[PDB]
Structures are given as C-alpha cells and as structure tokens.
Amino acid sequence: MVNYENVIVTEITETLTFFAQSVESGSKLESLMSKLHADFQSNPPIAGSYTPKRGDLVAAQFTLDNQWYRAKVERVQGSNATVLYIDYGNKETLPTNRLAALPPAFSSEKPYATEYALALVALPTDNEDKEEALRAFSEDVLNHKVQLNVELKVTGSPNLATLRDPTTKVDFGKQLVAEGLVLAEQRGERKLKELVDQYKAAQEAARVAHLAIWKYG
C-alpha cells in the first residue's frame, strides 16, 4: 500500500544520485520543448549579448545537438558558465555566448527532473569497483520506467529514494548490495531501521557468497 511514483530515470551521477522525471508529466515537457524550439527558431538570440549571474534561469544551447533547453546557471567564470539542464539532470561547462535570457513564459513551470540519493547505498573502496557499480545501476534503470519511493526527506540536499521494477518488484539498490557491487549504509533513523537491517543482510549474503568486491574476504 506504499504510494509509489511512476518515474523515468534520466541521469545518473558518479555518487549514485540520479535524476528522475514523472511519467504523467511527460506530455507537459514534450509541449514545452516544442514551443521553445519554435520560439528560438522564429527569433534566434544574438550570441554574446547575454552574460549570466550565478543562479540565473536561462535558455542554453546544448553542445551535443545545438538545441535550446531550460538551464540553471550554477557557476560563472569569465567567458564560460557551468549549467544544469533542469528538465533532464545533466550538467556541462559552456561558453556564455551559448546562453540567452529565458522568456518569462518558459520560466514558471517547475523543473521536470528531480535529483534523489539512492537510499542506503555506499560506493565501494576500489576505483574499478566504483565504475562497475555505476555501469550496473545505469543498465538497470537509465531511461526505464521504474517505481520510486521517497524514504527520507533531507534538508538542503537530494532526498533518499528507493527504485523498484514495476513487474518483479525488485529493489534495484538492494540488488546492487546483494550482488556485492556496493556497500550497505548504516544509519540511525528509526523509520529506516527495517530497510537498514534488510540491506545489511543482503551485504552479508554477498559476503558469504564471495561476490564481486567480497571475492577475497
């Protein structure tokens, strides 16, 4: 009877945080991107006429496809800026001449992607084990429809969330633990006790089975 949210995972970072879009907001973003494309084709901005302050919400021309996206300026350094593509979750450093003022019409809708921390998962000690963990998790969830549950709200940073396969009901983060690819996190929130204990047992099973990072005990 847990109220799962149907999401699509759109971006995964190197610390196993991830960005997810709501499935029922898919048409909303689709419409926005189509209107933004048409707007900036009809009235293309003048390159170099805009420079941002840190925090500005802008239109940014993605270096990959030369299309315009909604973006938050996170850092400005001379001729370049670091931006977050708020509807998808990826970041890049970019010349400021590829930034323009976002028309107030596109600025009111909340970001269509939200960042979360994968609940109770810690990356392994080895660097190559780290890579494999990120590869394995991306293969599991990237671009896929999954069920998300927020486990803990965190003030000032991404909330803790589990991800579940809609068909098998397998907890993806826990599966990473059971496969011996990541470590289980121990923490004290009583509401997280059951999940903490379960992830601990999964880690233990992977240890006994000598899986992956636990190969040489």
Swiss-Prot record:
It is found in: Cytoplasm; Nucleus. Residues 51-109 form the Tudor domain. Expressed in adult ovaries and testis (at protein level). Disruption phenotype: RNAi-mediated knockdown results in defective spermatogenesis. Signal peptide: none annotated. Residues 62-90 are annotated as: Involved in dimethylarginine binding. Endonuclease which shows activity towards both DNA and RNA substrates. Has a role in translation regulation throught its association with the with the RNA-induced silencing complex (RISC). Plays a role in spermatogenesis probably by negatively regulating piwi expression in the germline. Together with piwi, might be involved in transposon repression in the germline. Associates with the RNA-induced silencing complex (RISC). Interacts with the RISC components AGO2, Fmr1 and vig. Interacts with piwi. Tudor domain specifically binds peptides with symmetrically dimethylated arginines (sDMA) and may facilitate protein-protein interactions. This is Staphylococcal nuclease domain-containing protein 1. It comes from Drosophila melanogaster (Fruit fly). The gene is Tudor-SN.
